[PDB]
Design a protein around this ligand. Sequence first.
Ligand SMILES: [Ca+2]
Lengths: 223, 175
Amino acid sequence: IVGGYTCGANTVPYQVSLNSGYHFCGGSLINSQWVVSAAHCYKSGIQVRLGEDNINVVEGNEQFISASKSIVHPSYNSNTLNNDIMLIKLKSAASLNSRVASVSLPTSCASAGTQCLISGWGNTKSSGTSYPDVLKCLKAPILSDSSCKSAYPGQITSNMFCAGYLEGGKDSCQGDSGGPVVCAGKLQGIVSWGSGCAQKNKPGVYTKVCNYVSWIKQTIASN
Amino acid sequence: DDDLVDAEGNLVENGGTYYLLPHIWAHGGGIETAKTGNEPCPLTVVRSPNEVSKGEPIRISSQFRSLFIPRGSLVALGFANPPSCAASPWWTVVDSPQGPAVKLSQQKLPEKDILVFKFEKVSHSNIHVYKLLYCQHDEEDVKCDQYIGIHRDRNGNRRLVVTEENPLELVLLKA
Ligand SMILES: [Ca+2]
């Protein structure tokens, strides 16, 4: 997260870290058994870590749970970056408490201007890297489709939306992928892609969760 | 455990700098720029004549916000230290007297003009070696049905170009 702030330990109870010997992507807990992340974050043998703040060391509130099923949206196109969403089923239910909680799904798309909370352990600096030990937070607004498309001509499908600042300076970055974009208390997006980080006229592009809800609810009910 | 790995078993960082060398200690060395034909400045991407030079550190970037480079992901390749005359350090493929050739541009390029590459791992020798593919945006589904190769011209410049049976094998080494 570039240009954000330290969230605070367990202040984003639904934020998860997908681990494969090391943190490689974020995710969002939607219920005791399922996690939503990015499709481009697919890996076999994923270990889901809940209740994390400092991802480098154990602090007492983490829950490490192996993934039993990793379902990449059938229409995922790694070329065009379209349909960048993946569902993960924990092979063991998570103990829901004050530090580990699910985030509800949006049953209606959010409108431009709505302020969102984006989080992750990705790069925090520009033209250079610096990965944080603890979770970073960032407040950013959903942008309009016309603006999104003018910033990324020919690249924006209906399953994506831009959030952030045309001015640049604040945005998600490498390492935040698969992470949550929560607005008005619902998971409206998934940290997907972007050109650079916090660059001018190049805001973060996120998977538009609202289009995949019916599918998510269906998959959860039959797997 | 994913795809892109450097010459140390270590994973390749999205947006990191690497030296793109050859699989065979023959042909040439690392990648760099050169002024070929009638160019006003170093706009041609070539493989160093020196089969021992690590060439220029190259940034390898994916649009995805992941710290690694996703599987089957298109990537853009650009020089960490461009020639100055280039509006961008990112490579692109343009029609030249020698067919589509890898070159830098004096004009600022859009995402879709630079994200036209993709790596292909070679399990042979198991050593981390990849073939470089060239993808062109057809319609709602790009086609990565071409590779990048070499074209030794008149003066001996090993130019990177689009070929069919002259693919290039490379080993990425952190810089
Ligand atoms: Ca921890």
